[PDB]
Amino acid sequence: KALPRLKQRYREEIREALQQEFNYANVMQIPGVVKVVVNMGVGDAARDAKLINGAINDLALITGQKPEVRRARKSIAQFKLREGMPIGARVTLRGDRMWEFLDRLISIALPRIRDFRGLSPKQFDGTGNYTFGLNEQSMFHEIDVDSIDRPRGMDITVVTTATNDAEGRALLRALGFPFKEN
């Protein structure tokens, strides 16, 4: 007994508009976002093993779920990197929590970037999966932006059952990502 904003919108308008654009036979062919992905590469694992915990705490406060700590399966010593050194955190988002996260991101933070002209239409890949990146976490009001001791940027990537970049960009437009309309 509840509905998020973007999901109600998705089931109302966007499916209709893509149908009226691309004319699929079955509606099962309709594109739909599955999951959302978050990652943070600490990179100074061999110099600060504590920024890892810092990033864990930030993403906790940001996404409302305890992250995963991705280990280094290979040992490349030109970076000090050794088998099992924690280099980064990672979180998966699916469902109502995902739609809420996109609502927050599109409505609070991305309208808080400094001189946001536009996210490119060219972060796609093969079929329409949008892989962008943030330099700082100085933007989410979710975050306690008084306590941060360093910039700890991140990298986001958005995956969809779309089959090509045209359908991907069209769907993400209907959903309200500020592309550079070109």
Partner RNA sequence: GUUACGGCGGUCCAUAGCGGCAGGGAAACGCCCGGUCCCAUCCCGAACCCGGAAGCUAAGCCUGCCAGCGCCGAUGAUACUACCCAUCCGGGUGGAAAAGUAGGACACCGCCGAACAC
Residues forming contacts to another protein in the complex (CB under 8 A) are 2, 4-5, 22, 24, 29, 60-61, 63-66, 96-97, 100, 103-104, 106-108, 111-112, 116-118, 126-127, 141-142, 163, 176, 178-181
29: contact with RNA by CB under 7 A:
yes
96: contact with RNA by CB under 7 A:
yes
Return the number of the residue (5 or 71) whose C-beta is nearest another protein: 5
88: contact with RNA by CB under 7 A:
no
75: contact with RNA by CB under 7 A:
no
> Least distance to RNA from the beta carbon of 3, Å?
9
Return the number of the residue (90 or 104) whose C-beta is nearest RNA: 90
Ranges assigned E (strand) in 11-138: 33-41, 68-70, 88-94, 130-134
23 CB neighbour count, 10 Å cutoff: 7
d(CA 46, CA 57): 19
Q: Which of another protein, RNA, none sits in contact with 50, Cβ below 5 to 8 A by type?
A: none
> Least distance to RNA from the beta carbon of 182, Å?
31
Return the number of the residue (50 or 71) whose C-beta is nearest RNA: 71
Q: Which of RNA, another protein, none sits in contact with 180, Cβ below 5 to 8 A by type?
A: another protein
> Least distance to another protein from the beta carbon of 129, Å?
10
Q: Which of another protein, RNA, none sits in contact with 165, Cβ below 5 to 8 A by type?
A: none
> Least distance to another protein from the beta carbon of 64, Å?
3
- Give the DSSP letter string of the chain: ----HHHHHIIIIIHHHHHHHH--SSGGGS--EEEEEEEEE---TTT-SSHHHHHHHHHHHHHSS--EEE--SS--GGGT--TT---EEEEEEESHHHHHHHHHIIIIIGGGSTT---B-S----TT--EEEEES-S---TTS-TTS--S---EEEEEEES-SSHHHHHHHHHHHT--B---
